[PDB]
From TrEMBL, chain A:
Protein's cellular compartments: Nucleus
Family: Belongs to the cyclophilin-type PPIase family. Belongs to the SYF2 family.
Protein name: peptidylprolyl isomerase
Superkingdom of the organism of origin: Eukaryota
Regions annotated as coiled coil: none
Signal sequence, start to end: none
Automatic annotation (TrEMBL), chain B:
Protein name: Uncharacterized protein
Domain of life, source organism: Eukaryota
UniProt family annotation: Belongs to the crooked-neck family.
Compartmental location: Nucleus
UniProtKB/TrEMBL annotation, chain C:
Cellular compartment(s): Nucleus
GO CC term (a single one): Prp19 complex
Biological role: Involved in pre-mRNA splicing and cell cycle progression. Required for the spliceosome assembly and initiation of the DNA replication.
Record-annotated Pre-mRNA-splicing factor Syf1-like N-terminal HAT-repeats domain positions: 47-190, 294-448
Entry superkingdom: Eukaryota
Keywords for the protein's UniProt record, in alphabetical order: mRNA processing, mRNA splicing, Nucleus, Repeat, Spliceosome
Protein name from the UniProt record: Crooked neck protein
Keyword Nucleus carried by entry: yes
Residue ranges of every copy of the Pre-mRNA-splicing factor Syf1/CRNKL1-like C-terminal HAT-repeats domain listed in the record: 211-293
A GO BP entry: mRNA splicing, via spliceosome
Organism: Chlamydomonas reinhardtii (Chlamydomonas smithii)
Length: 80, 232, 595
């Protein structure tokens, strides 16, 4: 369900902000950067670790995760 | 109220505060604090303060505040899980029988069996039937029986339970002298009863037909039990 | 010994394992130029499959592109994803797999570009926007995540989109930004959900005058269509956890005023839940009782809830209220004049109002009024409630209106001839000691009855008119209408035995034996002869038993159980005889037995 996997997307959002970033991290990145506009496109100054964070984060997700006639009926006893 | 302010409380101090104002006969604040505590926790820790509050109202306002009594009961019902609607439904039936009217107590028990688990619906149905005997008699108890026969799930009662329901129904119908309705009830219980474990059911039916049945119905006995022995 | 059912053979066929294919042998493969040509082979395989099946059935470009990603060839895999999307760009699954390939290999500007395109082309798939925002905040790029949230808000998402934006700005403890989003949110989707969520945000936030501000602003801005249940439920709960309960009472009322009372059940039960704690005892009692009254007022627009309201008012002390409630319950005449249950219920409810005016109201004039209303609304020529007459008579008797009770009794009599009414009236006539009117009433009940003659004889005996009572019993025996009464027979026998007359009882016994040959009657005659010289009594009892067995023999050749019971009783009494000799008891028992 989009509501089910939506609260699971918020699971992932709040979990990953609790897991990969901190408030002084964020606020000193900002303190270096006055524009938090019209700067769209230009990549922002952030630590090179951040990248693998995302990658590792999603890769984390990863480790959580006759012949054809058997499947057919196995749909029907399922249903019938 | 400082303990209740910070939510460091349990059923214990709720009950304690409430009784302490009960003995200073401050029943009104006891009631408001019961209101505080009931929402202050969820069950099964709200069962005990609910028992105390239910009793504290029953004791003091019987016959004068029946409407708010049933207010209390109804909200206690809709917060309580299926696991303990039994004692609360019993309290509600008891008061609205003693001070109230038998008809809405009848519908009380109807609600209870509609609401309690199958495995104890047996002991709740015994109560419903006996109270209906006291207050409405023959046709009403018969309708209780058939209400306990025609209930498709999730109203489901157990085959051994429905077995002895059918047993009681025939034992009372043969009592009143309308034997063939009890014949019908036994045919009903046949489609539920695998014979091999329930020898008492078929024993009652057979020795029953020996006194009220004929050899045509006896061959239909060895035809029905035949079919069921084939069926399972 | 075992036979051939199907299924087992089918299982055997399954065991025969078909030709599921054996895995290709894992020959060791060198990495250089043996790799490259395996890659040529598998890429030509993919290009062949893709020119065949690629366009018409999806699935294939994902395999091709994940393989090229396994080869760590991302120029090639990006071209495979671009050829998927050149076929069908409206598939969100493909945009997701493309951008995720790009993300999981730290190609983050490439991923941003895929997201920009996916989110430009399908701006109505929320999930694209979510995953773009998520990718940006996983890189700790919250300015970029926020700019994606701004673009998304431009495409006007649902409540969940604006709520996710607000939660985003909260996650970085930016409550000024989240507040500006709430401003925009409640403007864009102007809703009760928008406003109550705004106010929940504020009451979490630290601001309670602002949460009040946002409810107030919801009713002014929202204006119309802020009239609804959950808006007022939320107003109530807010001002409740603000401990402004007078504010909350104003809220609950102004609601019930404005809300269509069709919508009122939940709001009103929750208001009851408010008064649960904060109200006063008789205050909340007033509230619930009033609401019950209108409940019944609409439900009659039902005798059991009627009696229940009677009980509620009577227990609440409100006397005039209970009077008016009984009045309204009697205002509902039975529309179906045939159902004895409903008319009986109506009579019991009016009798309940009667006992309320009688015991609780202390008004005997109002009691006479209620009972006379009951007497006039009950169509006696069809409806026969002796109970109403009896209770009215008791009321008139306690008040000592003797002639009044007599009038009401004669009224029920000349209206609906009733054995129970007549018997109670005669009881009450004996309770005054007016024996002559009692005789006249017994007579008028007889002319309209074994017990009428029986009660008249018993009265004459309780007056000592044993001769007059004996003549009355003789007349009772002489009429052809009460032919086979054994109960009046029992009464006459009892009067003859209590009157010292064994001989009158004997004449009665001869008449009773001549009349009906019952074996129990024969036993009773001989038993009367038995119970208190004693040897003469035993001898007379024996003569009776012998004549009885002889008669039941010559009259009842099949009725063996009758004479069998007779002989059983005979042997029992023969063993029970106070005999001066036990050998005589043995011989007499043997004589009774051998027969």
């Amino acid at each position: 369900a989009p509501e089910n996997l939506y609260q699971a997307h918020l699971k992932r959002a709040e979990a990953g902000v609790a897991a990969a970033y901190s408030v002084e991290d964020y606020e000193r990145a900002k303190a270096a950067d006055p524009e938090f506009s019209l700067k769209y496109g230009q990549q922002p100054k952030l630590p090179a670790a951040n990248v693998e964070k995302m990658v590792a984060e999603l890769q984390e997700r990863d480790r959580k995760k006759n012949d054809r006639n058997a499947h057919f009926n196995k749909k029907i006893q399922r249903a019938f | 109220d400082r303990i209740l302010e910070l939510r460091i409380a349990t059923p214990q101090v709720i009950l304690n505060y409430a009784l302490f104002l009960t003995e200073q006969k401050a029943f009104e604040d006891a009631f408001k604090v019961y209101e505080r505590g009931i929402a202050l926790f969820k069950y099964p820790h709200v069962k005990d303060i609910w028992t105390a509050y239910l009793a504290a109202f029953v004791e003091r306002y019987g016959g004068k505040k029946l409407e708010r009594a049933r207010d209390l009961y109804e909200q206690a019902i809709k917060d309580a899980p299926p696991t303990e609607c039994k004692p609360l439904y019993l309290e509600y039936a008891k008061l609205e029988e003693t001070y109230g009217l038998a008809r809405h107590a009848m519908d009380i028990y109807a609600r209870a069996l509609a609401a309690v688990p199958k495995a104890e619906r047996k002991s709740v149905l015994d109560l419903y039937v006996s109270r209906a005997s006291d207050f409405f008699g023959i046709a009403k108890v018969r309708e209780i029986y058939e209400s306990a026969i025609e209930a498709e799930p999730p109203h489901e009662l157990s085959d051994d339970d429905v077995r002895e329901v059918c047993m009681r129904y025939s034992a009372l119908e043969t009592k009143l002298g309308e034997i063939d309705r009890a014949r019908a009830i036994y045919v009903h219980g046949s489609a539920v009863s695998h014979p091999d474990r329930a020898a008492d059911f078929w024993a009652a039916w057979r020795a029953f037909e020996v006194r009220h049945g004929n050899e045509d119905t006896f061959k239909e006995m060895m035809r029905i039990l035949r079919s069921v022995k084939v069926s399972f | 010994d075992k036979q051939i059912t199907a299924e087992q053979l089918l299982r055997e066929a399954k065991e025969i394992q078909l030709e599921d294919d054996y895995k290709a042998p894992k020959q060791i493969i060198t990495d250089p130029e043996e790799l490259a040509e395996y890659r040529l082979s598998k890429r030509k395989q993919f290009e062949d499959l893709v020119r065949r099946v690629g366009r018409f059935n999806g699935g294939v470009w994902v395999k091709y592109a994940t393989w090229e990603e396994q080869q760590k060839d991302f120029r090639r895999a990006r071209s495979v994803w671009e050829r998927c999307l050149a076929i069908e760009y409206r598939n969100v699954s493909m945009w997701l797999k493309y951008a995720e390939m790009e993300m999981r290999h730290r190609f983050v500007n490439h991923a941003r570009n895929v997201w920009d395109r996916a989110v430009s082309l399908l701006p109505r798939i929320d999930q694209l926007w979510y995953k773009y925002i998520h990718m940006e905040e996983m890189l700790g790029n919250v300015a970029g995540a926020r700019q994606v949230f701004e673009r998304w808000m431009r495409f006007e998402p649902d409540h969940t989109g604006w709520m996710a934006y607000i939660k985003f700005e909260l996650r970085y403890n930016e409550v000024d930004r989240a507040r500006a989003i709430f401003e925009r949110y409640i403007q864009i989707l102007p809703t009760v959900k928008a406003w109550v969520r705004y106010a929940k945000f504020e009451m979490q936030n630290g601001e309670v005058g602002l949460a009040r501000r946002c409810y107030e602003r919801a009713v002014d801005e929202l204006g119309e269509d802020a009239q609804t249940e959950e808006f007022f439920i939320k107003f109530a709960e807010f001002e409740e956890k603000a401990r402004e309960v007078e504010r909350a009472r104003a809220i609950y009322r102004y609601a019930l005023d404005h809300i269509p009372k069709a919508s009122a059940p939940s709001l009103y039960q929750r208001f009851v839940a408010f008064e649960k704690q904060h109200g006063d005892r008789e205050g909340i009692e007033q509230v619930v009782v009033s609401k019950r009254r209108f409940q019944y007022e609409e439900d009659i627009a039902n005798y059991d809830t009627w009696f229940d309201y009677i009980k509620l008012e009577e227990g609440t002390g409100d006397i005039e209220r209970t009077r008016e409630v009984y009045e309204r319950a009697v205002a509902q005449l039975p529309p179906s004049s045939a159902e004895k249950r409903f008319w009986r219920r109506y009579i019991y409810l009016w009798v309940k109002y009667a006992l309320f005016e009688e015991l609780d109201c202390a008004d005997p004039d109002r009691t006479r009024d209620v009972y006379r209303a009951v007497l006039d609304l009950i169509p006696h020529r069809q409806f026969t409630f002796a109970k109403i007459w009896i209770m009215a008579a008791k009321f008139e008797i306690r008040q000592r209106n003797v002639e009044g009770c007599r009038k009401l009794l004669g009224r029920a009599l000349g209206l609906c001839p009733k054995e129970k009414l007549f018997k109670a009236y005669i009881e009450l006539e004996l309770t005054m000691g007016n024996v002559d009117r009692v005789r006249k009433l017994y007579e008028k009940y007889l002319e309209w009855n074994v017990g009428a003659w029986v009660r008249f004889a018993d009265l004459e005996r309780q007056l000592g008119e044993t001769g007059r009572a004996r003549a009355l019993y003789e007349l009772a025996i002489g009429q052809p209408l009460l032919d086979m009464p054994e109960a009046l027979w029992k009464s006459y026998i009892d009067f003859e035995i209590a009157a010292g007359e064994r001989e009158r009882v004997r004449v009665l016994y001869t008449r009773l034996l001549d009349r009906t040959k019952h074996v129990k009657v024969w036993l009773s005659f001989a038993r009367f002869e038995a119970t208190p010289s004693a040897p003469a009594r035993a001898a007379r009892a024996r003569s009776v038993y012998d004549r009885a067995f002889t008669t039941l023999r010559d009259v009842s050749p099949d009725s063996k159980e009758e004479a069998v019971l007779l002989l059983e009783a005979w042997r029992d009494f023969e063993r029970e005889q106070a005999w001066s000799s036990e050998a005589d008891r043995a011989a007499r028992v043997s004589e009774v037995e051998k027969k």
